[PDB]
Amino acid sequence: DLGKKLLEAARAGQDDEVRILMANGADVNATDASGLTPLHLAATYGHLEIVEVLLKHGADVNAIDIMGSTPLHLAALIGHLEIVEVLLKHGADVNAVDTWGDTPLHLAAIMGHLEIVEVLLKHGADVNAQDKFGKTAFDISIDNGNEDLAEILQK
Amino acid sequence: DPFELLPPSVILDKFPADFQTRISSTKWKDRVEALEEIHNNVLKPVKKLAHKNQDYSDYLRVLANVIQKDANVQAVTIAANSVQLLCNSLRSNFTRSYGAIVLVPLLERTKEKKPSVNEAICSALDAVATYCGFDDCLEETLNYMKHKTPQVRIECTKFLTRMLQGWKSDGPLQNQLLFKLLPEVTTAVLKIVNDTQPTTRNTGFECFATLMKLVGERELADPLEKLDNLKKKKIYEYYEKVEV
Amino acid sequence: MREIVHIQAGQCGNQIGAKFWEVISDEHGIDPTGSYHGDSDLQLERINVYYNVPRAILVDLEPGTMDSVRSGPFGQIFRPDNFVFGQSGAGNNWAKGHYTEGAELVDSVLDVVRKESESCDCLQGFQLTHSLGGGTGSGMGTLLISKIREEYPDRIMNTFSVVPSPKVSDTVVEPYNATLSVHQLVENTDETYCIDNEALYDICFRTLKLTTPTYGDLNHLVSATMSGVTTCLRFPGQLNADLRKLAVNMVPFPRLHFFMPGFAPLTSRGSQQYRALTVPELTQQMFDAKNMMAACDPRHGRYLTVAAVFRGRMSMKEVDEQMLNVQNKNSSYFVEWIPNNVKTAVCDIPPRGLKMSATFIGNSTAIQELFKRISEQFTAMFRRKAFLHWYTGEGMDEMEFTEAESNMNDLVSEYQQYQDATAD
Ligand SMILES: Nc1nc2c(ncn2[C@@H]2O[C@H](COP(=O)(O)OP(=O)(O)O)[C@@H](O)[C@H]2O)c(=O)[nH]1
Ligand SMILES: [Mg+2]
């Protein structure tokens, strides 16, 4: 399966061998087992050139997986500021929700990616968005002792 | 009828050429894959090994080498599961050479506290016990109850408890248990009963109430008196809750 | 109960470790060559505790750290044999430190531990400094602990573990490493001082007004805290004298042995403290959450036990009064069912630079806030299963993460139980 080799590459980060596999017509939106496209995997492990290659060949920027995770979720979780702005520029879902009720703003706030938090907010993030337990991004800064984040959330 | 009468399987021809060097490698994953292969591909499928004219005492002495000394706890876990498989699918083989080649290594490695690893090491010790009943285990299990590591004490004593629940009464009452009962078994179980740690002591309390159940709460009433009245009622607690 | 063997593992381990040896070598009057140039007997009274030359073992998988220590100021003093270093590094992989690469080296380390313990009149216990978000300090350290725990079960295990925070390193696997390591410490150590990088940054940034704190800036706060809590151990004194007596009077339940340290006054790197504080001022740096080395609010929980160490010449009468005061004027914050749970001790020799100082070791249930933060970060990471192939590749099982997750949450619930408990 050529859609499975393109996931192997986009994950481990062999920039050159993506172009090889894609020139062989590999499925840009090929799902693995839990529904993760190559754009998901590259946006998780920080391979910026592989993200922009897949997006311009037609990668579902707002593709979800078995747990409702968009690539912007995973980029905002791990903290890849370079990739976050690339996805948003390609029409990413700034207020996407996943199976646990989190938005990308929730994940960037939990992991302390203050520089990414400000990017999401300026792209119209839902500051008052709630999760399953009922907590906003502002509640996380209150609960987690981060006053640098509380100030960045009320800006 | 013994269901073991089904035709037996042979595994010596299954081994690969690159194996002795892989298991005797410095890279952990070489050793792991080597062991993990012959276990999932070669041992796990079969259901009866070849009794006739098969020398496994070259293979088993390298499972011991890793179970004892190998620094990778993962390589330990997958090896003791191999050892169990051999002792399980080839019943009535581990007479002495086989049984004794892996016994004292296994008892040393109960020191491991990771649940998955203690699971595998103990379960293999149960395998050799069910087919090498009190051959060398009674003599060597006691030895490692006297050992300095706290974890090996509670586990090798739990081991004697496991073995004792499945004890055999063939012959008169001059089995290996009675030849060494008061001299060795009891003198060693009291060392556990009187340990500094509670969780250690609490294993001895079962391992003494499972002892009384086998050999009469009257015979051992002599060391019962020398014991605290406070520890006595804990020992009796298990005596009421332990079966045979 | 005399000698203490010291260990430092990982980059952070050797950093705050060497800083600690810098501080207390001065306080004891030892030069980098290893010769006494002091002028007091209270200095060499209990020098046999940490010295023989330090009773210190240096460990790291990263071999470069070797030279970062010896090329330091007091780097010449450590015994050459007690350097035990690997070829490659762990690279923020707890599994590499605990199961694969760190395990291959751990034997060489235990050989040196044995050697130093062999020549001890009467060992007290051990002392480990390390970081929890790393791969070596956390993975090999916690593995070293258990290996010592089973080789020396009649001895105390006391750790100075520093907690990762996004404010100091943006590495997202640190919640994994720290959570797995807490699962070890709750089962393997008698007492652990919780150094939170979150709180060290918030102190250097907000209280000391340093716009960008460096490691050296945070390490200054740590090394001073260590000498403060170890003041009882290193000088003559009645109360909290040895490691076991301390833990006996600090830890009422075996799993709940995570201390929230904090001390006063907070100074910068070599700044000038014009007017030495008064006794009531020092005392009022206890509840002051801006002095806690762990990012927790004591107001949000209850103190189980408290140990106070006042350093310097001052009124023992006034200290007793101020401590007895602050307890009963905030009686709802100290647990009622443990009477005389706060204990104070004084040492006449102050720390260098300061005329007076005060260290505040506290077992506060508020520490559950700290474990909440790590758990939420861990779970957010773990529910999306990020970077799991690192750990599983090194022989770990996915189940292990679930157990560590649940075991830390049980630890949080336990703290919450005793917080809501009543004497009635
Ligand atoms: N306070 C302090 N924390 C550190 C220092 N170095 C690293 N850390 C923290 O420790 C974690 C990194 O682990 P580290 O010790 O460098 O990895 P190791 O070499 O494999 O043990 C991160 O959370 C860092 O914030 C230091 O010098 N001081
Ligand atoms: Mg390192």
UniProtKB/Swiss-Prot annotation, chain C:
Omega-N-methylarginine modification sites are R311
Q: Motif MREI motif: where?
A: 1-4
Q: Which GO terms describe its molecular function?
A: GTP binding; GTPase activity; metal ion binding; structural constituent of cytoskeleton
Q: Which residues bind GTP?
A: Q11, E62, S131, G135, T136, G137, N197, N219
GO biological-process terms attached to the record:
microtubule cytoskeleton organization; mitotic cell cycle; neuron migration
Q: Which GO terms describe its cellular component?
A: cytoplasm; microtubule
Q: Which cofactor does it need?
A: Mg(2+)
Q: Record keywords: Methyltransferase included? A: no
Q: Any idea which residues bear Phosphothreonine here?
A: T278, T283
Which location does the Swiss-Prot or TrEMBL entry give for the cross-link Glycyl lysine isopeptide (Lys-Gly) (interchain with G-Cter in ubiquitin)? Answer: K317
Task: Alphabetically list the UniProt keywords.
Answer: Acetylation, Cytoplasm, Cytoskeleton, GTP-binding, Isopeptide bond, Magnesium, Metal-binding, Methylation, Microtubule, Nucleotide-binding, Phosphoprotein, Ubl conjugation
Where is it located? Cytoplasm, Cytoskeleton
Domain free text: The MREI motif is common among all beta-tubulin isoforms and may be critical for tubulin autoregulation.
Q: What is its biological role? A: Tubulin is the major constituent of microtubules, a cylinder consisting of laterally associated linear protofilaments composed of alpha- and beta-tubulin heterodimers. Microtubules grow by the addition of GTP-tubulin dimers to the microtubule end, where a stabilizing cap forms. Below the cap, tubulin dimers are in GDP-bound state, owing to GTPase activity of alpha-tubulin.
Question: What is the protein name stated in its UniProt record?
Answer: Tubulin beta chain
Organism of origin is Sus scrofa
